[PDB]
Amino acid sequence: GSLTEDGLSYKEKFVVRSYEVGSNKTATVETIANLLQEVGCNHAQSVGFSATTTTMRKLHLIWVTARMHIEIYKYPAWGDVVEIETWCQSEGRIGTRRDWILKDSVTGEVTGRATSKWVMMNQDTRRLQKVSDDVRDEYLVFCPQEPRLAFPEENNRSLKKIPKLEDPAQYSMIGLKPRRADLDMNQHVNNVTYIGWVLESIPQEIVDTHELQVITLDYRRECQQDDVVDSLTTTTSDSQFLHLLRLSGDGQEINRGTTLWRKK
Amino acid sequence: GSLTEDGLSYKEKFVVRSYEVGSNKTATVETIANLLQEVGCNHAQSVGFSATTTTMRKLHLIWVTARMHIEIYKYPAWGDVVEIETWCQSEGRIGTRRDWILKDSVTGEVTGRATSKWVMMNQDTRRLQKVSDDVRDEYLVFCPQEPRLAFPEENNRSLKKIPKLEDPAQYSMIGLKPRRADLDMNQHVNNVTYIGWVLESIPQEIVDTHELQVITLDYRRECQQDDVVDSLTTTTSNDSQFLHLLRLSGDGQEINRGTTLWRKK
Numbered sequence: 001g002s003l004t005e006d007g008l009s010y011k012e013k014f015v016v017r018s019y020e021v022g023s024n025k026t027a028t029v030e031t032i033a034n035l036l037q038e039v040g041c042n043h044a045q046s047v048g049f050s051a052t053t054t055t056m057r058k059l060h061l062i063w064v065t066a067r068m069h070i071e072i073y074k075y076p077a078w079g080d081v082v083e084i085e086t087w088c089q090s091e092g093r094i095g096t097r098r099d100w101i102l103k104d105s106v107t108g109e110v111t112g113r114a115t116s117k118w119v120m121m122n123q124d125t126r127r128l129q130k131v132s133d134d135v136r137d138e139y140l141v142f143c144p145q146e147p148r149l150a151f152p153e154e155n156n157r158s159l160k161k162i163p164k165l166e167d168p169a170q171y172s173m174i175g176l177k178p179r180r181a182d183l184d185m186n187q188h189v190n191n192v193t194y195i196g197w198v199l200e201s202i203p204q205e206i207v208d209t210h211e212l213q214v215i216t217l218d219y220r221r222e223c224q225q226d227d228v229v230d231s232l233t234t235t236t237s238d239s240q241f242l243h244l245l246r247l248s249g250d251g252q253e254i255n256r257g258t259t260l261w262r263k264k
Numbered sequence: 265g266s267l268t269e270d271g272l273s274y275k276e277k278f279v280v281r282s283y284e285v286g287s288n289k290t291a292t293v294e295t296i297a298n299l300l301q302e303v304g305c306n307h308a309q310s311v312g313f314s315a316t317t318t319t320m321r322k323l324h325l326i327w328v329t330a331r332m333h334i335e336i337y338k339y340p341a342w343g344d345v346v347e348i349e350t351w352c353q354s355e356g357r358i359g360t361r362r363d364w365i366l367k368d369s370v371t372g373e374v375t376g377r378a379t380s381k382w383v384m385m386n387q388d389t390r391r392l393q394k395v396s397d398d399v400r401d402e403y404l405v406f407c408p409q410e411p412r413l414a415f416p417e418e419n420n421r422s423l424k425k426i427p428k429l430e431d432p433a434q435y436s437m438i439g440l441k442p443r444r445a446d447l448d449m450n451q452h453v454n455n456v457t458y459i460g461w462v463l464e465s466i467p468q469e470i471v472d473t474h475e476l477q478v479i480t481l482d483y484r485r486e487c488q489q490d491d492v493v494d495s496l497t498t499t500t501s502n503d504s505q506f507l508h509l510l511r512l513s514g515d516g517q518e519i520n521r522g523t524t525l526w527r528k529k
């Protein structure tokens with residue numbers, strides 16, 4: 001991996017691993033999501049971050065994912081090389097955005113794209129704080145000044161309002177728990193595990209006959225390592241689904257999302 | 265990755281990823297186990313396998329893991345480079361063995377080692393069988409002829425008989441289920457998931473104060489994607505030792521037994 005010539009974005013190549021592929025001999029969407037997360041971390045390290053700034057560590061402030069949107073046109077097989085380009089952008093006082101472009105390293109064609117919204121939070125009180133002027137200045141020297149969007153189109157899937165699934169759900173997977181492998185270096189559940197949990201309630205026949213083209217996921221609350229999750233799905237339609245992750249006990253919402261699947 | 269000069273072993277380098285590390289800022293034993301599996305698959309591909317031979321595919325035969333033994337002296341941090349060397353060896357009609365040596369690519373020092381026993385099974389009936397002469401000749405051209413052991417020592421930990429945990433277990437983690445990420449390309453539960461399930465019943469205080477040095481795991485039966493597992497652990501012991509058992513949640517059918525050795529940080 002390396003920052004590009006202008007130093008305002010970062011590229012990295014990954015050779016797809018044997019254990020990273022699913023039943024259709026291609027990388028799972030969870031493998032793709034882990035690769036996006038890895039190239040984002042490597043971009044942060046290359047420009048001097050932990051992605052907390054100096055002001056943020058003094059104030060006990062962190063960036064948290066509010067939304068993840070991923071569109072995949074082609075999944076890579078075991079042995080294939082995926083090139084990922086990533087960059088960040090300030091969105092005023094609302095927060096920050098991280099975007100990705102996925103390419104087949106051999107042909108140079110675009111095989112996918114992703115966008116994510118991040119909000120500022122106090123790590124102890126868990127209260128959202130709105131971006132301050134001091135923090136914005138520290139982040140802007142690493143971001144392109146003119147807008148650079150992975151999803152530019154006016155009225156695109158990435159900025160759609162997602163509704164709350166109504167009981168009863170058409171499909172469900174109950175009693176989902178994280179294990180130690182699902183936790184990051186700070187003992188928090190990895191954001192990619194929530195994507196896996198959402199997809200657990202899609203029936204196996206859809207997975208066997210369709211490929212996932214689009215996934216939009218809102219993050220409302222964290223799931224703790226001792227929490228239990230229920231995954232709910234309803235067909236809204238290509239096949240489209242509405243999703244809800246909630247705590248098994250009280251029914252507290254942790255995530256809501258939508259998926260779009262194409263017939264193979 | 266590449267086969268070595270003599271073509272009888274395979275080497276590969278891996279840079280440790282941000283999502284591959286645990287609470288200690290080092291690679292989890294599950295990340296290590298996935299890397300061993302990846303370098304084993306790349307070794308098989310480099311010499312023409314897919315690791316069924318031509319005779320095995322004709323007779324609906326597969327290699328299945330009977331035992332996995334891993335010893336780690338040092339865990340790599342995010343950004344570190346781990347070099348893994350792997351090779352195979354015939355063990356007569358009992359089966360085959362795959363061995364690994366893990367090194368720090370920068371210093372060249374040995375940071376870990378692993379050995380695994382594989383038995384032949386008919387894919388459909390699930391019946392184990394001894395290795396035939398025709399199969400033996402087909403993989404001996406890819407194996408060193410003189411013995412080459414990652415665990416050469418006489419009374420080494422890798423060949424120890426593991427007992428069956430007696431109820432009640434000291435610790436337990438109940439209702440463990442695989443998700444789609446835990447399944448391989450053939451929709452079978454990945455062998456590394458069983459290692460994670462065994463470790464789920466170790467208390468968090470041991471994980472917070474000790475590092476895993478050794479893990480020996482016997483594979484008795486396969487867990488299906490719609491099966492539920494219970495993970496059981498009892499302390500048997502500076503060092504901490506545990507006895508482990510994975511069994512199906514319903515009938516209590518054994519799927520795995522194992523032992524772990526942990527050293528104080």
Ligand SMILES: COc1ccc(NC(=O)CN)cc1
Nearest residue numbers: 064065066191219220221222
């Ligand atoms: C109430 O505000 C929020 C709280 C939590 C999140 N996200 C996560 O904690 C998921 N990693 C997003 C917004």
Ligand SMILES: COc1ccc(NC(=O)CN)cc1
Nearest residue numbers: 328329330455483484485486
């Ligand atoms: C009946 O004998 C055996 C059955 C299964 C295994 N191993 C695995 O299925 C590992 N996933 C080993 C021996």
